[PDB]
Amino acid sequence: APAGFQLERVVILSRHGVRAPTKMTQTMRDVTPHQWPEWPVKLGYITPRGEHLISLMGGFYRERFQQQGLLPKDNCPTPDAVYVWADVDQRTRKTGEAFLAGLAPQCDLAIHHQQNTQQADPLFHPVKAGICSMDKSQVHAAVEKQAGTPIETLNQRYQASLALMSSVLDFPKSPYCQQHCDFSQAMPSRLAINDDGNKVALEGAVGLASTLAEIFLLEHAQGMPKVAWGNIHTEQQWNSLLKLHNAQFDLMSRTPYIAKHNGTPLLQTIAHALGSNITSRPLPDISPDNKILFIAGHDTNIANISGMLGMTWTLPGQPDNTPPGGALVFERWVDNAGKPYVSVNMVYQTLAQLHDQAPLTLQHPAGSVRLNIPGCSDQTPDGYCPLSTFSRLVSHSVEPACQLP
Ligand SMILES: [Cl-]
Ligand SMILES: [Cl-]
Ligand SMILES: [K+]
Ligand code: NA
């Protein structure tokens, strides 16, 4: 950092770690003659390896923040300094615990989360929680705007990637094709919404391939002996398959109309934690002297925040834009005249770092991409957005109806 700059605190919005598939539907089984490999935990759970991998990130964060004077160079942080808010799911709660175990091994720290884990946390899922609702016609129009073309035509944008997915699956030899054969032709894209407008999905080949491609990446990150039945051989193939996943996320999570309805609570919380002079539902029991706020959520949350702030990225060595344990790290810096700024980085394990379970240290670091905020036209060439500007950008991107009551 520049002479005189001081790191005052950090807010980390992290995806959970490596998990088993959330579901394995009959369509997912039917589109390949091969058998999907069994995971060593319940569907949707983080695996012990996933936990380990998150702890490696915690250790990296410890080294980075110690070097910047934010945490002590040895022995436990004071507990007021570090706070975890995790979503209700096993995968997110255990990610929060694994982060603490890497950040502060054998320190007696515990996470926080919503008391009732059987209901949505409106910080992560305000629409499912009933805080606000989307208008179905507006969703359809906003997704088309984001795609730049009618959604029914989306497969035509991804012919090579869909053909590769077909070959990796051996789709033409699949029970699906014995009952219903070209992967793209068989499964045209369409946007499906429930009656209330609170459940939205991209149906068809791109949506399905997005899910499958992420499962292969997860298998790889889990160190399974057979990933995609041995059918992914090259970096180009990984990139081509994950292109479908990143596109699905751009459409279904980055699209600003959707992103602000799902992301308002989190963006307000993050901004407030960085020092924006706004009203935000307080996190229970958080200290005024908090230095590190770690929020354990989902890929969709990171994508929503990216859409609200107009941030886009590609991660060297990591084909998924929202990889397991990848996090947006928001840093509040002040210069020697006491002016506050926000920097934002995407910090992540490369595909190799996941697969190899690489130790992460300052000498052998996690990946990190410094982000441009396009609306922050005063952002410095070295990446610092004046907090006063960041605050105004947040204020214009949030949906007031979706603020936590
Ligand atoms: Cl289990
Ligand atoms: Cl495991
Ligand atoms: K900028
Ligand atoms: Na999945």
Author numbering: 4 to 183, 189 to 413
Please quote the paper that reports this structure:
Phytases (myo-inositol hexakisphosphate phosphohydrolases) catalyse the hydrolysis of phytate into inorganic phosphate (Pi) and lower phosphorylated myo-inositols. The enzymes share a common catalytic site architecture located at the interface of the two domains involving the conserved N-terminal active site motif RHGXRXP and the C-terminal HD.
The first attempt to co-crystallise HaPhy with the substrate analogue MIHS, at pH 8.4–9.1 led to the tar-HaPhy crystal. The structure was isomorphous to that of the apo-enzyme with the same disordered residues. The active site contained a tartrate molecule, a component of the crystallisation buffer and a well-known inhibitor of HAPs. The tartrate superimposes rather closely with the 6-sulphate moiety in the MIHS-HaPhy complex and the Pi in the Pi-YkPhy complex described below. There is a second tartrate, modelled with an occupancy of 0.25, close to a two-fold rotation axis, where it coordinates with His116 and Gln118 from two symmetry related HaPhy molecules.
